[PDB]
Each structure stands twice: as C-alpha cells, then as structure tokens.
Amino acid sequence: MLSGLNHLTLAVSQLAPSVAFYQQLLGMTLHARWDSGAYLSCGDLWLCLSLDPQRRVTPPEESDYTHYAFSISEADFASFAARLEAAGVAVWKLNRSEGASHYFLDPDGHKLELHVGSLAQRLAACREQPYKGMVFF
Amino acid sequence: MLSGLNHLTLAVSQLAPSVAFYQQLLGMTLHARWDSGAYLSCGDLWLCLSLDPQRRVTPPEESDYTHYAFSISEADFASFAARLEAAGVAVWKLNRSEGASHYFLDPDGHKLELHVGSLAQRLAACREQPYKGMVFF
Ligand SMILES: NC(=S)c1ccc2c(c1)OCO2
Ligand SMILES: [Mn+2]
Ligand SMILES: [Mn+2]
C-alpha cells in the first residue's frame, strides 16, 4: 500500500541557481548538496534537485499543465507573492478557482504554485458547485 | 513560509486510463472525477489528474529526470513492484542509486517511483556511501 509522497525530484540545468531559488528565495531547508544534486525539505516534503544536462529551460507555452503546489497560509500569501514579484519571478497563469493561488515558474520553467486550501476544502466547494460531469465517491 | 506540498497535478492525455492506473493499479483513493479531471489521495498527498490536450505520451529517453516517488513499507515493497512488473508496467531505471526503489512509468510516461525510506534515512545512508562531492548541512 502506498502511504504518501516520498519525494519530488526536479531535473535542473544549473545547480547553483536552483539551490538559490529553492533555499534562499523560497525558504526551504538545504540538508545536503553534491556535485550533481541537492536535498531540501519544505515541511514534510522531501525535494531533490538533480543536475541533468537533458533539462531544457522550457517556456510555459511549451510544457503541459503538470505542476507542483506548495502550501502557505492565507495570512502569509500576499507577502510571499510580493517577494516573488520583487525577485522578477514569472507568472504562468492567473487564479480563477477557489482558494488563493499564485502560479510561478522556477529557473528551468518548472510550473509551481502557492495555494491556500486543502483537498477537503476543494471537495466541499465542488459539492456545492460541481464541475461539468462531476461525480463523487 | 512554505509548509509542504499542497498538491501534485499531473497532465494526462486520456482521463479514464489514468484514473484507472492511479486508483485500480496503484491503490490510491478516488474522491471525485469530472469531464476534465480527477482528485485522488495517497495518504496525505492530494493528487490531481488534469486532462490536457497538450500532454504527450513521452518515452523515458525523451524526458528529463524529473520524477515522483511514493512511499511504501519495506514489507510491501517487493510484492508491489513485482505486481507492477507482471502487469506489464513500463520501466525507466534499474540502478538503485538512491536506495530501495522501483522506477516505473504511468500511461503518459510520467516518471514514478516506489521508495522505501525517509529523507533522514537517506542522509544517514549517504554519510556511509556519499554521492561524489557530498556535503551535509
Ligand atoms: N466509471 C466512472 S466513475 C466514469 C466512467 C466514465 C465517465 C465518467 C465516470 O464520467 C465521464 O465519463
Ligand atoms: Mn494547482
Ligand atoms: Mn527518486
């Protein structure tokens, strides 16, 4: 039986700017670094950055909707978004769903999100206003 | 600050086979589906499958090392891996370079992994068998 997400690994083209982005800009804890990668944590999340020459710096129009959302409190959301904006971090989408969301790109074009709200909150909203064709289990 | 992974969203090319893969084959809990997506959980992980016309079925030699690992116990690891193998699930990596792991592909070629062990356990193992140039903080 699978019990959760064990780790998220992102392929990166340049290790130093990716470490700076996740550790310094985004505030994650750096636990180890080696010639070709790094291990960080963000709460329970184990993040691995893996130096990969096959990673392309990918414009958002050229990648699909796969994306990684990090939790933040409502109270902290706006100042964190403003921090990313001050740092010149690009936005790839505007929020049009329930719960605050800020959609931003990492240095290689990985699609990231700040989101406020749990699955339970989303399901409650959907039960009141179901998406087209929605069925619950 | 950021507190963990709020959700993982995977773009999928065909919703029904992807739902079947994550729910039936991997055993995740299906909470809701709609014409363009589904919500599942795996322990505390919120997984969203999002129907995306841009998603391509991607062979593993064409994608970078970005991947998603799910936790499994030492007691369940081998039989779950063997069941995926017997079911014909494609693979993408064989060398265990980060501990006890099984590397497999979803129907669209998303790179998945079964892994036994926490970040703390991986750091302890790396102290004895470190990656080249490894530094611990
Ligand atoms: N087996 C299920 S729950 C199902 C099958 C097909 C569906 C669907 C749901 O909504 C759109 O088309
Ligand atoms: Mn999202
Ligand atoms: Mn891994």
B59 DSSP 8-state letter: -
- In angstroms, rounded to a whole number, what is the distance separating the alpha carbons of residues B101 and A33? 21
A135 close to ligand 1 (CB < 6 Angstrom): yes
C-alpha pair distances (Å), A44 with each of A41, A115, A120:
7, 16, 19
Q: Among B81, B89, B129, which Cα is nearest to B109's? A: B89
- In angstroms, rounded to a whole number, what is the distance separating the alpha carbons of residues B35 and A116? 24
Which residue in the set A52, A65, A130 is minimally distant from B11, CB to CB?
A65
Query: Which residue of chain A is at minimal alpha-carbon distance from B8?
Result: A68
Query: Is A113 annotated in some ligand binding site?
Result: yes
3-state secondary structure string, A21-82?
HHHHHCCCEEEEEECCEEEEEECCEEEEEEECCCCCCCCHHHCCCCEEEEECCHHHHHHHHH
Q: Among A34, A73, A97, A57, which Cα is nearest to B9's? A: A97
- In angstroms, rounded to a whole number, what is the distance separating the alpha carbons of residues B57 and B14? 10
Q: Residue B27 carries which side chain, given as an amino acid letter?
A: G
3-state secondary structure of B5: strand
* CB neighbours of residue A127 within 10 Å: 11
Contacts of A37 (CB under 8 A, 6+ apart): A15, A48, A49, A50, A51, B131
A108-120 core/surface letters (b: 16 or more CB in 10 A; e: else): bbbbbbbbbbebe
Contact A58, A109 (CB under 8 A): yes
- In angstroms, rounded to a whole number, what is the distance separating the alpha carbons of residues B31 and A123? 8
Contact A52, A11 (CB under 8 A): yes
Q: What's the token pair of residue B102?
A: 């099984």
Q: What CATH number does the domain containing B136 carry?
A: 3.10.180.10
* CB neighbours of residue A60 within 10 Å: 17
CB contact under 8 A, A7 and B119: yes
Q: Which chain A residues have a beta carbon less than 8 Å from that of B92?
A: none
Q: Tell me how the structure was determined.
A: X-ray
- In angstroms, rounded to a whole number, what is the distance separating the alpha carbons of residues A121 and A4? 19
Q: Give A26 to chain B, closest Cα distance, Å.
A: 7
A18: number of CA atoms within 13 Å, CB side? 24
Cα-flanking dihedrals φ and ψ of residue B55, to 5°? -65, 130
Cα dihedral A51→B59→B79→B7 (10° resolution): 60
Q: State the alpha helices, DSSP H only, in chain B.
A: 15-20, 74-86, 119-128
Q: Separation of A45 CA from ligand 2 center, angstroms? A: 16
Q: How many domains does chain A contain in total?
A: 1
- Which residue in the block uniquely carries the two structure tokens 């990648």? A63
- In angstroms, rounded to a whole number, what is the distance separating the alpha carbons of residues A19 and B132? 17
Contact A12, A109 (CB under 8 A): no
Which residue in the set A56, A63, A123 is minimally distant from B31, CB to CB?
A123
* CB neighbours of residue B75 within 10 Å: 9
Q: Which chain B residues have a beta carbon less than 8 Å from that of A63?
A: 54
Cα–Cα–Cα angle for B104, B43, B70, nearest 5°?
Answer: 20
- In angstroms, rounded to a whole number, what is the distance separating the alpha carbons of residues A66 and A124? 24
- Residues forming beta bridges with residue A68, ordered by sequence position: A112, B8
Query: Is A67 annotated in some ligand binding site?
Result: yes
Interface test with B, best of A1, A51, A68, A131 (most B CBs within 10 A): A1
- Which residue in the block uniquely carries the two structure tokens 């130096």? A51
Domain hosting B4: range is: 1-137
